[PDB]
Amino acid sequence: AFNDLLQQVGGVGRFQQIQVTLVVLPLLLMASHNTLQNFTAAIPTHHCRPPWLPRDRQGQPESCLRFTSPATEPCTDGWIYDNSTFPSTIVTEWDLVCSHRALRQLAQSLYMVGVLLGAMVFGYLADRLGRRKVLILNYLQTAVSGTCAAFAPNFPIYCAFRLLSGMALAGISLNCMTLNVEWMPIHTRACVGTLIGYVYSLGQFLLAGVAYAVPHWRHLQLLVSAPFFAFFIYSWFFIESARWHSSSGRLDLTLRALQRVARINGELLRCPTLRHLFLCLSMLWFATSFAYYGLVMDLQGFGVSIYLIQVIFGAVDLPAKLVGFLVINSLGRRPAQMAALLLAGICILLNGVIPQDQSIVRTSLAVLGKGCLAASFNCIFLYTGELYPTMIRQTGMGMGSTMARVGSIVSPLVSMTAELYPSMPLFIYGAVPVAASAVTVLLPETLGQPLPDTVQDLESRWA
Numbered sequence: 001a002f003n004d005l006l007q008q009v010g011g012v013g014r015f016q017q018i019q020v021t022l023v024v025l026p027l028l029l030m031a032s033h034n035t036l037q038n039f040t041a042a043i044p045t046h047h048c049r050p051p052w053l054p055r056d057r058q059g060q061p062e063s064c065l066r067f068t069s070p071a072t073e074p075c076t077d078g079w080i081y082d083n084s085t086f087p088s089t090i091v092t093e094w095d096l097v098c099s100h101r102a103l104r105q106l107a108q109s110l111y112m113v114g115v116l117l118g119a120m121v122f123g124y125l126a127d128r129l130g131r132r133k134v135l136i137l138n139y140l141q142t143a144v145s146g147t148c149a150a151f152a153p154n155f156p157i158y159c160a161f162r163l164l165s166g167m168a169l170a171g172i173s174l175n176c177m178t179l180n181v182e183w184m185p186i187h188t189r190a191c192v193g194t195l196i197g198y199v200y201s202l203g204q205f206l207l208a209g210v211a212y213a214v215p216h217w218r219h220l221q222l223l224v225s226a227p228f229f230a231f232f233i234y235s236w237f238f239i240e241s242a243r244w245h246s247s248s249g250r251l252d253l254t255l256r257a258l259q260r261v262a263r264i265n266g267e268l269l270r271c272p273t274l275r276h277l278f279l280c281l282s283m284l285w286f287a288t289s290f291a292y293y294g295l296v297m298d299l300q301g302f303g304v305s306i307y308l309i310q311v312i313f314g315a316v317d318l319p320a321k322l323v324g325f326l327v328i329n330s331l332g333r334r335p336a337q338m339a340a341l342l343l344a345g346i347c348i349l350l351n352g353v354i355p356q357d358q359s360i361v362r363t364s365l366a367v368l369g370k371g372c373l374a375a376s377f378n379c380i381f382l383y384t385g386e387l388y389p390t391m392i393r394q395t396g397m398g399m400g401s402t403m404a405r406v407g408s409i410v411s412p413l414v415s416m417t418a419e420l421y422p423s424m425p426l427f428i429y430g431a432v433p434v435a436a437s438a439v440t441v442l443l444p445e446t447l448g449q450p451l452p453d454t455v456q457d458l459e460s461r462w463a
């Protein structure tokens, strides 16, 4: 087959290495954009501007009411914002405060809409028309759209321009895995799948470095999206996947692509047996994505600085993956997933009840929540591939992944309930994973058996 021909020129070689580094290099900035809203939309302290002010029950001045005389009158005028730590954010620029608390959460929602939208349209287009031709278009779109939001004068312009950047980013991530797996032989088709996560996790460190140097949100937003233009120049000289050319009936160009390598080197829901598994796998993607993005979106509530608390989050992943790796090879994929989920949900519940006065305890069970979900989010993907049959494994993983973003959409929407009850958002934020722990019990497979090529062995393995 094609696998022998790919290894005929030497398999992985000088041509192969130079292609892998270039495509995976922007993945460092890939994770920067997801949590960029955290630093850009930071909310500072503020008090009403007189043309003294009442204080709260804890001894702090109010933020929406002003003394009628030196009755109670709403803050018709603006407010003076702190400049000791945050020179300027979108809250300081546009009045997203008081009666407009929910507006800031809305900006994140449409960002999650853009990434969801880019999975369908671009995925459909990436097969009808050449694969690498989509990658160049996505690279150019994210460079122009990123810099336009840095100069948006009106709030509706900011939301609209951010949505277009979300569509471009989704296609970049999807095409990175598809293009690389085509030119990598099956004998080394798993090493790349582990390097991506390490590069994905290292993105959290880069955001901390740039945030300290550039406090201004207008300059910080520009800096993150600035290098993407540079990657567009290098992306011109790529090589299209040879497997796709033969599939569409374009073999005549396949030989030329192969020759250049040598010189350089030297329907799913149509059967009960699948609908039972799909429903069980459905709640696993949803629950994990719900809790994961519900803890990273806010980190200023705790008593530690935002910069320091971020670097702890980006380094706790390394112990998390090591523990999960040992349990996978010793106890099993299913026992690891269930144990992690029940432990993660319990940790979140205890955080809400515990008072915020003691910061040391508060950050102890807040870091553990991020670390636990990091291990679970890696277990689910590995188990998913082993379960689905080869006929629909490619479609099943994509369908399962395209719904994980649906959980990310709901995550900031539930945060609007803080207006009524401040602790209320934490109640649902940990209740869902615990109820999801009762889904893994009904899964009728485990690990240690040969992979199912056909559906005929699914019932045989059950009995």
Ligand SMILES: CCCc1nc(C(C)(C)O)c(C(=O)O)n1Cc1ccc(-c2ccccc2-c2nnn[nH]2)cc1
Pocket: 034, 115, 193, 194, 196, 197, 198, 200, 377, 378, 381, 401, 402, 404, 405, 408
């Ligand atoms: C750390 C974030 C996880 C995540 N976020 C998204 C959003 C931003 C909502 O799109 C998605 C998604 O596209 O569905 N995912 C899935 C994902 C799962 C595992 C991994 C992973 C982690 C460690 C090692 C390997 C992988 C991996 N396996 N397959 N692809 N990546 C990466 C991404």
Ligand SMILES: [Cl-]
Pocket: 170, 173
């Ligand atoms: Cl993604």
